[PDB]
Write a protein that binds this ligand. Structure first.
Ligand SMILES: CCCCCCCCCCCCCCCCCC(=O)OC[C@H](COP(=O)([O-])OCC[N+](C)(C)C)OC(=O)CCCCCCCCCCCCCCCCC
Ligand SMILES: CCCCCCCCCCCCCCCCCC(=O)OC[C@H](COP(=O)([O-])OCC[N+](C)(C)C)OC(=O)CCCCCCCCCCCCCCCCC
Ligand SMILES: [Zn+2]
Lengths: 244, 30, 231, 236, 207
């Protein structure tokens, strides 16, 4: 319902803030199992819901909503235990999610007016605007998972930390919701050169600043793995100095 | 007929050249 | 393709030149660099396929010849021609008339090297509203107006194609033939006085073209320019 | 003020720098680029002495070359890309006519062996797109349009029409009220009376449209820029 | 009654401007399209994102709308002129390849059609879904050319039915023309640097 800038800001800005606040409280005023258990449940519930709802949607905004719920879920799975490696991977996931979602909203905002509310209006973006279609595919595959991207690297370090922290249960559900998401998305992308029912050649195209911001983040996503040392280092500094 | 006759634009241009000169000096003090 | 690299960096440099000039103009407080006016260079190139018109060959200032098009002396390109030479070149000999409202076209790129050239060999009249797409027309030819010559056609040596008629692919009109209608079918034979008349019309239009060009070189009439700047 | 004078000097300097950069770029290019010229195109011109005589209330699109002795009367229009070339013989078009864009009129055989051929277009004649008129006499209120072509001493008459491909040839006396077509031309209908009124109404409303296009196309740079900014701000 | 107003210009020193607004009806080209410099776009014409209107053409949609689709092309001396009152307009759909001397008053060309040279479309007619006219085609008023048919003759007639080779090859021809258009467009380089010419002219003559 809410307009696109409003919902973008609502997705990106408050979530990081409230996550930092949750971390600051859960380090200090928790119990042995109270908060960890009240989150361990919501994490699996979130991954499952993201999968089994985003699998079937017919509005390009609600799909974004359920994918956001899913990634918040993955982050909460990262929250499960309380070791340094775990919270490190937690913060890394938060950051990667912030970037990916400003990217996705850049796209869905540059595809706004002629497509007031539709998902079938991927009217040959492979043909009428190929670079934009490639960028959308990159952002989505990063949002879900594929060989080296940003989102895949983030989820992989999340599950690495989870396994090494003493929870052999979040990985199965996490990997299976990831793989159903991947099947669905990679079926959607490869559905972009079968045929095209509708066509919405667009007066929209990305004046200058949406284009620059997009280009920057999209170059970041693919090019993250060739040098992810400083992010790990700064996240280590942060998480280590959160309480110690 | 040898001048620019728009006050606001001229103030803005003074501000712009001041900006670029200041940035150059700042860099010179890196 | 080092030439094409030079061309591209030339575009970059000249484009920076235009931009810095416009910055200078905005600083100087003069927005005259917006007076939209049609470029329409009557002779135009693409990369190195510039036309080549011989001196003393009248080309109306409203024509449009672009691509590899070459044309020889005593020729006339009368107001409203489109001579395209992008893919395959156009060659046009001496003493020829390509009248107003005519294009000597070249088929947009077909897959194979099926893009035939177009040759228009001297002493040829090509009247008003004439489309010649990929053809071979030779000396002492008459193409009387309303004419269409589709790709693959060869007309030669004192031959006439009447009026308002089209000639399909792969058709040949040799000496002493007139074809007409849709499609172009053979009607009858010619007459020797008619052939001499072909030649005389060629010469008469050569003279007409001399006159028109000498008039088109008449110093641009500043009075109307200062008038239109007044109001 | 003095600040204005200073920045005027600075702007002139950097404009000179821009011109120099542009010449440097053309010289890095060269041999190939045909740099742009001024218009150097005549909307009206003479040949030997015959200047064109054009009504004041006419429309002439600035992409229509009238050359020779063209006598064009009132309430008419010579639309875009047109070529009225009567350099050899006389052209007189009636008042209230219209040459709908991208057409041509030429004459050939001035005063040879006694027989001459002028060219005349009657009143309220609406010749259409790509019409070729090569030495003809079209009486007033006659319809010719959409690619027709008349070859020789043809004379159309009194509400007759030739439509969409009519290649009319070699001294055809078109009957007074018919339609023709065919390549070559033959008749196939009877030209109903409401259709006669159609051609009349066509001439009239097309004169109207031509007046609109004139009022638009005859503007100066400052007025055009004003119109554009106003249109943008209003559509805002 | 032939009084010539001496204030009539005979050398406009700026050719027929490309984009002719007609009283708050600014015709619109997309930043990807390619119109020649000679062409004249007057009134309610829209060139949609990949089309090409080649040299020596005129589109004056002053009665109705004229809209060129995705990568359609309108060749050299075409004239598109919306017919009298109605909605009767001119729509050129996604992949249409018009001919050299095309004359279109009002009509609709549904996607993937090809029209040869010297084509005329009289007063409002449909040519739908992969139809191919031939050279010298003339479509009488109120005609419909159905799916996958090749027509010819004036007036138009039936010739044969299309083979799927040709029906699949039509968009290939469309995109080939679009690439040629890309070449010219890469050549044209905006702003034309003619204000320098008018400036030196004005300086040497007057001011
Ligand atoms: C220099 C900053 C400035 O204000 O320049 C004003 C001048 C004149 O301002 P102006 O009001 O004539 O127009 C500037 C606005 N644009 C660029 C959109 C047309 O503008 C510039 O110099 C901008 C371009 C150079 C930027 C470096
Ligand atoms: C060597 C480099 C020399 C650069 C000289 C300054 C160029 C300024 C160009 C300019 O005025 O752009 C305005 C235009 C404003 O665009 P616009 O849409 O307002 O229209 C004016 C456009 N031109 C310049 C073509 C008339 O700027 C841009 O389009 C983006 C400029 C990006 C920033 C460039 C400078 C570096 C900081
Ligand atoms: Zn002639």
């Amino acid at each position: 319902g809410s307009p696109t800038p409003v919902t973008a800001f609502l997705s990106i800005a408050p979530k990081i803030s409230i996550f930092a606040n949750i971390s600051r409280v859960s380090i200090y005023g928790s119990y042995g199992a109270t908060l960890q258990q009240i989150f361990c449940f919501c994490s699996i519930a979130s991954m499952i819901l993201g999968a089994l709802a985003a699998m079937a949607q017919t509005k390009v905004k609600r799909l974004l909503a359920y994918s956001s719920i899913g990634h918040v879920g993955y982050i909460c799975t990262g929250f499960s235990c309380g070791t340094i490696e775990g919270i490190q991977s937690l913060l890394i996931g938060i950051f990667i999610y912030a970037l990916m979602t400003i990217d996705a909203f850049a796209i869905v905002l540059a595809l706004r007016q002629t497509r007031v509310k539709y998902i079938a209006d991927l009217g040959a973006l492979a043909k009428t605007n190929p670079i934009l279609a490639i960028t959308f595919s990159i952002t989505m595959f990063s949002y879900v998972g594929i060989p080296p991207l940003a989102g895949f690297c983030s989820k992989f370090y999340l599950f690495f930390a989870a396994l090494g922290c003493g929870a052999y249960f979040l990985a199965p559900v996490g990997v299976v919701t990831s793989v159903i998401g991947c099947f669905y998305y990679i079926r959607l992308a490869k559905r972009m050169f079968f045929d095209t029912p509708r066509t919405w050649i667009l007066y929209e195209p990305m004046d200058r600043d949406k284009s620059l911001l997009l280009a920057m983040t999209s170059s970041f996503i693919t090019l993250f793995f060739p040098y992810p040392s400083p992010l790990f280092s700064v996240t280590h500094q942060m998480a280590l100095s959160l309480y110690l | 007929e040898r001048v620019s006759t728009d006050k606001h634009r001229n103030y803005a241009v003074v501000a712009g050249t001041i900006t670029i000169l200041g940035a150059l000096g700042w860099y010179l003090k890196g | 393709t080092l030439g094409r690299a030079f061309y591209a960096v030339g575009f970059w440099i000249r484009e920076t030149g235009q931009a810095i000039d416009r910055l200078g103009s905005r600083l100087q407080g003069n927005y005259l660099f917006q007076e939209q006016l049609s470029r329409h260079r009557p002779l135009m190139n693409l990369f190195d396929k510039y036309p080549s018109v011989h001196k003393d060959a009248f080309v109306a200032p409203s024509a449009s010849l672009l691509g590899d098009v070459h044309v020889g002396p005593a020729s006339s390109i009368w107001y409203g021609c489109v001579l395209r030479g992008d893919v395959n070149g156009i060659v046009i000999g001496s003493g020829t008339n390509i009248q107003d409202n005519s294009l000597v076209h070249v088929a947009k790129s077909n897959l194979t090297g099926k893009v035939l050239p177009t040759i228009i060999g001297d002493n040829v009249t090509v009247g008003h509203s004439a489309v010649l797409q990929g053809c071979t027309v030779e000396d002492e030819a008459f193409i009387g107006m309303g004419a269409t010559l589709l790709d693959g056609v060869y007309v030669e040596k004192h031959a006439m194609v009447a009026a308002g008629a089209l000639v399909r692919q792969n058709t040949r009109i040799p000496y002493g033939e007139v074809w007409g209608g849709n499609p172009a079918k053979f009607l009858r034979k010619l007459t020797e006085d008619e052939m001499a008349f072909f030649s005389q019309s060629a010469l008469n239009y050569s003279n007409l073209a001399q006159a028109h060009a000498a008039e088109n070189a008449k110093e641009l009439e500043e009075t109307e320019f200062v008038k239109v700047l007044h109001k | 003020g003095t600040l204005g004078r200073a920045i005027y000097s600075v702007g002139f300097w950097i404009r000179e720098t821009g011109q120099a950069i542009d010449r440097l770029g053309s010289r890095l290019q060269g041999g190939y680029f045909f740099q742009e010229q001024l218009s150097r195109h005549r909307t009206l011109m003479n040949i030997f002495d015959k200047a064109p005589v054009v009504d004041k209330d006419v429309f002439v699109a600035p992409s229509a070359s009238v050359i020779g002795d063209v006598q064009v009367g009132r309430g008419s229009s010579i639309w875009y890309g047109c070529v009225l070339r009567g350099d050899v013989n006389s052209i007189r078009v009636g008042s209230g006519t219209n040459i709908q864009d991208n057409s041509l009129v030429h004459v050939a055989k001035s005063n040879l062996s006694g027989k001459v051929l002028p060219t005349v277009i009657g009143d309220n004649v609406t010749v259409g797109h790509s019409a070729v008129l090569h030495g003809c006499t079209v009486e007033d209120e006659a319809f010719v349009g959409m690619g027709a072509v008349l070859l020789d001493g043809v004379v159309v008459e009194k509400n007759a029409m030739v439509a969409a491909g009519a290649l009319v040839r070699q001294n055809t006396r078109i009957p007074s009220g018919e339609v023709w077509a065919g390549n070559p031309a033959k008749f196939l209908r009877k030209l109903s009376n409401e259709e006669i009124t159609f051609i009349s109404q066509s001439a009239i409303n097309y004169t109207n449209l031509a007046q609109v296009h004139a009022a638009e196309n005859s503007k100066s740079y400052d007025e055009i820029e004003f119109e554009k900014v106003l249109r943008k701000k209003y559509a805002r | 009654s032939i009084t010539p107003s001496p204030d009539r210009v005979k050398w406009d020193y700026r050719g027929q401007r490309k984009i002719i607004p007609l009283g708050q009806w600014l015709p619109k080209v997309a930043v990807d399209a390619y119109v020649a410099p000679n062409v004249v776009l007057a009134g309610q014409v829209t060139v949609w994102d990949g089309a090409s209107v080649w040299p020596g053409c005129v589109l004056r949609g002053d009665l109705n709308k004229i809209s060129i689709g995705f990568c359609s092309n309108v060749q050299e001396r075409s004239v598109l002129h919306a017919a009298w009152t109605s909605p009767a307009d001119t729509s050129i759909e996604r992949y249409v390849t018009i001919g050299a001397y095309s004359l279109l008053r009002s009509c609709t060309i549904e996607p993937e059609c090809i029209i040869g040279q010297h084509s005329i479309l009289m007063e409002g007619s449909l040519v739908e879904t992969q139809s191919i006219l031939e050279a010298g085609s003339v479509v009488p008023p109120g005609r419909r050319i159905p799916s996958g048919e090749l027509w010819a003759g004036n007036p138009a007639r039936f010739v044969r039915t299309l083979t799927h080779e040709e029906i699949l090859e039509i968009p290939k021809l469309a995109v080939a023309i679009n690439d040629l258009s890309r070449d010219h467009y890469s050549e044209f380089l905006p702003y034309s640097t003619v204000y320098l010419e008018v400036e030196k002219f004005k300086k040497s003559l007057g001011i």
